[PDB]
């Protein structure tokens, strides 16, 4: 066809020669019954990938013909095929390609704005997508083009409002980051000024989630400072409040609005960030300040019932010890059964504990290993002891193994109350997480290659007695604690390279070492120093949220939720009041 030719053109008033065609046959929308594939938008397609003059005026007269067609869907109506763009508009192109005219002339040919494009920007909101591509007069234009705007109101098939998609596309990149910010308050205060009474955050994404709350369950960061940090004021934006105040100082004496931030109410900002959050790295946040001085103060606070606890534990070690070291090869036998019984209290008491703190987790997947391992060791403690009593009244043989590995491990669990008391704990810490993982990687090759020399003395010595395969590794092992032998003797007779060999083992374990060594140092050399720091507050921070809330072990089963914040002094304009918190200083 004339306009099949002009799928390519430059010229579409050859394809108005051929609307005449159009105009003659009763065919409406011969655009998919043209040449044109790829959903059949490609001439629109085409008019946007031209950029005639830095606009379309190829587009306009076309935009007019298609018009003329009256047809039952115009070309706008296409929907881009799946899973690079699914459904994704020719208008959509349009504000991919920076286009402002001719999709204001899209717009005034009367294309609509709710659509799903899937691509990595989800712009399901058009207005969305322009604010992806960082472009306010398009979204202005919005507002008013055609006449109408689109509410922002308005959410997608994910349920993530316009907001929800800003922060989902906010990335570390602080050029990228500052200018959504910028877009971000900026559309905050137009909605503001255009709905303008309405709740522009708040509204639940696919899992519920105000912005903010999405902010912090993908993780992001500067903007979360931002709508944490936040000044508007004027006209009406202390409406929005910006989550600040300030009064009585010479230097900003500040009120905070600590509202989903309350850490009572439902899932808070911060129940969100210490557990649902996953995370790249989450000991910067609670760095921030508005938090961590709520903190601190929860902290001071809650002091008291902490180091109770930790006295409490401490007894019940003292307890078990003396229980197993008194307890002779079988005061007085009462005071014994005193003993075992006592510790199958504490053995229940705590699985119980523990596990019902699983059970709040729902069993959520623990990559919070990390931060978590004391939990486990905890519940591993528990049920051992529990099983050691059990096989004592049933008298089973193997009791007192698995009793004593429950005390050792029972002492090497308590350090866990270092997490509160010192300072230097941090860096006990931040080692603990990257030296063990390093060390893990390392033994696992130790123990290899010298499970292949074990056998390698053993077959050599096969034929005093040196053989035993557990024996001769570990006759091997005691040189790595310096014990060691590597004696010679031509007993063997094949000595010489006997002793060659172990040896090699010798040289080749050290050279192991220290390649470990080093390869750590190093991995601390580079160091965020105060990032430990913040490892340690918020490893402090998931104790608190946790002691929060009483005991459903039931030595106290409720806590009150008695945790609050001052009342608002704002009744600014028609909102007449809040709820919140008081900062100083600075």
């Given at each position: 066809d004339r306009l099949f030719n002009v799928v390519a053109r430059g010229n579409p008033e050859d394809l108005a020669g051929l609307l005449e065609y159009l105009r003659r046959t009763s065919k409406y929308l011969t655009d998919s019954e043209y040449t044109e594939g790829s959903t059949g938008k490609t001439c629109l397609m085409k008019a946007v990938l031209n950029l005639q003059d830095g606009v379309n005026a190829c587009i306009q007269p076309l935009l007019e013909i298609d018009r003329d067609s009256?047809?039952?869907?115009?070309?706008?109506?296409a929907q881009c095929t799946d899973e690079y763009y699914r459904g994704h508009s020719a208008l959509h192109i349009a504000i991919e390609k920076r286009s402002l005219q001719c999709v204001k002339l899209l717009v005034e040919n009367g294309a609509n704005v709710h659509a799903k494009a899937c691509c990595f920007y989800f712009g399901e909101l058009p207005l969305s997508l322009a604010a992806c591509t960082k472009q306010w007069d398009v979204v202005n234009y919005l507002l008013e083009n055609p006449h109408p705007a689109a509410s922002l109101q308005a959410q997608d098939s994910l349920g993530n409002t316009v907001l929800h998609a800003l922060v989902m596309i906010a990335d570390n990149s602080p050029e990228n980051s500052a200018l959504v910010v910028r877009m971000y308050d900026g559309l905050l205060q137009a909605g503001a000024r255009l709905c303008p009474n309405v709740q522009l955050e708040g509204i639940p994404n696919l899992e519920g989630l105000t912005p903010l709350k999405l902010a912090a369950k993908e993780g992001k960061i500067e903007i979360f400072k931002h709508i944490l940090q936040r000044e508007f004021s004027a006209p009406c934006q202390s409406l929005s409040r910006k989550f600040t105040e300030w009064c009585y100082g010479p230097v900003r004496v500040s009120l905070y609005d600590l509202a989903s931030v309350d850490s009572w109410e439902e899932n808070s900002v911060l129940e969100i960030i210490a557990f649902h959050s996953r995370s790249p790295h989450r000991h910067r946040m609670v760095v921030l300040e508005p938090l961590n001085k709520l903190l601190q103060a929860k902290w001071d606070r809650l002091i008291p019932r902490f180091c109770f606890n930790f006295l409490c534990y401490l007894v019940y070690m003292l307890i078990f010890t003396a229980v197993a070291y008194h307890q002779p090869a079988l005061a007085g036998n009462s005071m014994l059964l005193l003993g075992h019984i006592l510790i199958l209290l504490g053995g229940v008491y705590l699985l119980l504990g523990q596990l019902w703190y699983f059970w709040r987790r729902r069993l959520?997947?623990?990559?919070?290993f990390m931060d978590s391992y004391f939990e486990i060791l905890f519940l591993l403690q528990a049920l051992l002891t529990v099983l050691s009593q059990v096989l004592c009244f049933l008298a089973i043989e193997w009791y007192l193994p698995l009793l004593v590995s429950s005390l050792v491990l029972g002492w090497l669990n308590l350090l866990y109350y270092t997490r509160g008391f010192q300072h230097t704990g941090i860096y006990s810490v931040m080692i603990q997480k990257v030296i063990l993982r390093d060390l893990l990687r390392f033994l696992l090759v130790y123990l290899v290659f010298l499970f292949g020399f074990a056998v390698a003395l053993v077959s050599l010595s096969r034929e005093p007695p040196y053989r035993s395969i557990l024996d001769a590794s570990l006759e091997l092992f005691k040189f790595t604690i310096g014990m060691g032998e590597l004696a010679f003797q031509e007993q063997l007779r094949f000595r010489g390279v006997v002793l060659l060999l172990l040896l090699a083992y010798v040289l080749l374990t050290y050279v192991l070492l220290l390649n470990m060594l080093i390869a750590l140092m190093s991995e601390t050399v580079n160091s965020v120093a105060t990032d430990s720091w913040s490892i340690w507050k918020l490893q402090k921070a998931i104790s608190v949220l946790e002691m929060e809330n009483g005991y459903w072990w039931c030595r106290r089963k409720k806590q009150r939720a008695g945790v609050m914040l001052t009342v608002g002094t704002r009744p600014d304009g028609s909102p007449d009041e809040r709820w919140c918190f008081r900062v100083g200083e600075m």
């Amino acid at each position: 066809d004339r306009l099949f030719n002009v799928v390519a053109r430059g010229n579409p008033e050859d394809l108005a020669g051929l609307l005449e065609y159009l105009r003659r046959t009763s065919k409406y929308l011969t655009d998919s019954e043209y040449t044109e594939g790829s959903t059949g938008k490609t001439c629109l397609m085409k008019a946007v990938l031209n950029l005639q003059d830095g606009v379309n005026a190829c587009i306009q007269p076309l935009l007019e013909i298609d018009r003329d067609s009256g047809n039952p869907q115009p070309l706008v109506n296409a929907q881009c095929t799946d899973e690079y763009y699914r459904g994704h508009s020719a208008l959509h192109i349009a504000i991919e390609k920076r286009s402002l005219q001719c999709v204001k002339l899209l717009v005034e040919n009367g294309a609509n704005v709710h659509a799903k494009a899937c691509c990595f920007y989800f712009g399901e909101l058009p207005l969305s997508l322009a604010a992806c591509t960082k472009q306010w007069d398009v979204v202005n234009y919005l507002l008013e083009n055609p006449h109408p705007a689109a509410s922002l109101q308005a959410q997608d098939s994910l349920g993530n409002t316009v907001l929800h998609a800003l922060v989902m596309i906010a990335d570390n990149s602080p050029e990228n980051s500052a200018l959504v910010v910028r877009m971000y308050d900026g559309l905050l205060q137009a909605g503001a000024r255009l709905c303008p009474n309405v709740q522009l955050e708040g509204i639940p994404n696919l899992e519920g989630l105000t912005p903010l709350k999405l902010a912090a369950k993908e993780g992001k960061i500067e903007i979360f400072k931002h709508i944490l940090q936040r000044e508007f004021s004027a006209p009406c934006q202390s409406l929005s409040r910006k989550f600040t105040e300030w009064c009585y100082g010479p230097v900003r004496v500040s009120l905070y609005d600590l509202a989903s931030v309350d850490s009572w109410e439902e899932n808070s900002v911060l129940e969100i960030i210490a557990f649902h959050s996953r995370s790249p790295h989450r000991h910067r946040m609670v760095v921030l300040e508005p938090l961590n001085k709520l903190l601190q103060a929860k902290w001071d606070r809650l002091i008291p019932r902490f180091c109770f606890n930790f006295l409490c534990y401490l007894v019940y070690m003292l307890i078990f010890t003396a229980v197993a070291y008194h307890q002779p090869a079988l005061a007085g036998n009462s005071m014994l059964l005193l003993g075992h019984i006592l510790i199958l209290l504490g053995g229940v008491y705590l699985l119980l504990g523990q596990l019902w703190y699983f059970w709040r987790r729902r069993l959520f997947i623990w990559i919070s290993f990390m931060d978590s391992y004391f939990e486990i060791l905890f519940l591993l403690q528990a049920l051992l002891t529990v099983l050691s009593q059990v096989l004592c009244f049933l008298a089973i043989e193997w009791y007192l193994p698995l009793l004593v590995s429950s005390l050792v491990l029972g002492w090497l669990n308590l350090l866990y109350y270092t997490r509160g008391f010192q300072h230097t704990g941090i860096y006990s810490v931040m080692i603990q997480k990257v030296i063990l993982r390093d060390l893990l990687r390392f033994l696992l090759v130790y123990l290899v290659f010298l499970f292949g020399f074990a056998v390698a003395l053993v077959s050599l010595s096969r034929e005093p007695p040196y053989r035993s395969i557990l024996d001769a590794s570990l006759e091997l092992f005691k040189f790595t604690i310096g014990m060691g032998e590597l004696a010679f003797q031509e007993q063997l007779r094949f000595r010489g390279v006997v002793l060659l060999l172990l040896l090699a083992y010798v040289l080749l374990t050290y050279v192991l070492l220290l390649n470990m060594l080093i390869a750590l140092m190093s991995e601390t050399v580079n160091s965020v120093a105060t990032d430990s720091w913040s490892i340690w507050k918020l490893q402090k921070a998931i104790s608190v949220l946790e002691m929060e809330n009483g005991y459903w072990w039931c030595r106290r089963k409720k806590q009150r939720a008695g945790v609050m914040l001052t009342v608002g002094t704002r009744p600014d304009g028609s909102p007449d009041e809040r709820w919140c918190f008081r900062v100083g200083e600075m």
